[PDB]
Design an enzyme around this catalytic site. Sequence first.
Site, PDB file in Angstrom:
ATOM      1  N   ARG A 234       0.779  -1.248   0.000  1.00 44.28           N
ATOM      2  CA  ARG A 234       0.000   0.000   0.000  1.00 44.28           C
ATOM      3  C   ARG A 234       0.813   1.301   0.000  1.00 44.28           C
ATOM      4  NH1 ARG A 234      -3.386  -1.100   5.429  1.00 44.28           N
ATOM      5  NH2 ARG A 234      -3.905  -2.897   4.105  1.00 44.28           N
ATOM      6  N   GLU A 263      -3.457   7.060  -7.126  1.00 44.14           N
ATOM      7  CA  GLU A 263      -3.397   6.351  -8.400  1.00 44.14           C
ATOM      8  C   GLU A 263      -4.795   6.172  -8.983  1.00 44.14           C
ATOM      9  OE1 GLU A 263      -1.529   2.701  -7.210  1.00 44.14           O
ATOM     10  OE2 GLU A 263      -3.460   1.728  -6.816  1.00 44.14           O
ATOM     11  N   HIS A 281       0.189  -0.347 -10.986  1.00 42.66           N
ATOM     12  CA  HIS A 281      -0.443  -1.246 -10.024  1.00 42.66           C
ATOM     13  C   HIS A 281      -0.932  -2.552 -10.632  1.00 42.66           C
ATOM     14  CE1 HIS A 281      -2.469  -1.286  -5.784  1.00 42.66           C
ATOM     15  NE2 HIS A 281      -1.848  -2.416  -6.069  1.00 42.66           N
TER      16      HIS A 281
END
Length: 318
Positions: A234, A263, A281
């Site tokens: 995270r 993001e 990601h």
Amino acid sequence: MTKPEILQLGPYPAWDQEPLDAAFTVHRLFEADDRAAMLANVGDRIRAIATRGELGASRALIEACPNLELISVYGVGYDAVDLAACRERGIQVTNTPDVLTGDVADLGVAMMLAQSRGIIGAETWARSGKWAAEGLYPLKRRVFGRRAGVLGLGRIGFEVARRLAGFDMQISYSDIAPKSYAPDWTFVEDAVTLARDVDFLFVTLAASAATRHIVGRDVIEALGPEGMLINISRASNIDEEALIAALADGRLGSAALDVFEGEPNFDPRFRDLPNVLLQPHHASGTIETRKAMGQLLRDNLTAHFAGSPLLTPVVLEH
């Protein structure tokens, strides 16, 4: 005959949507012109919610589904599900753990290698024609046999360490306590000390870090001018302002990041730095992992309505 009625809060890939629609009467809240109208119409009917880690399930939504039995989450995290509301009501919750672990660890290690050996620039070097027209790509930096630290040695961190061992790295780790499954790696109490003695630091913290495990200026500075930070967990566990300043100053050598605050609208300054590998990601982004996650979500729902035990519960019936 019955096709149990469920409320789906966000889209899923077609390979999950099709079998979901085949087995259940699925109400897509995310396609409704008017939220309140759909909830008035079908709220009483809803026996399960299918959601995602991001979207969760609010108290008000739970209240609108008075006969709710189960909330099944696509993904590992379930922060945004209101657990207090669930426990008040005897609502059970499931997630999709374990199936993403190996692919996340794979990308983390791949990222370290790509940044250390300058693979991005090397591709461009050959592709653009500068290899022929200018000459050698600059010499880059060795990975194997060097020192690596793993911050958080849970499922993901463990898998990272296993991969690093194949590169004969000197491996240390920090966590809340030593792990029984890490007999050959050095336990370190705090992140600053961990960082001080390594060339590559992987951030694989599954939850919000304890104070001594948070990655701030001191940890970053200890990682040092030729150290590399790799983040596949995270964003909240890294001070991005401290990280950006250190990369700009040369106090940190480089970073490889798969996750960012806000993001996909990540801080533009990450784009300006010459020592940052960006990834969108996608640590868990493989066909096999995503199918397995979707399958697990569906298997929990199937098990629930069949009267069988839940596969991966995270909240019991209180």
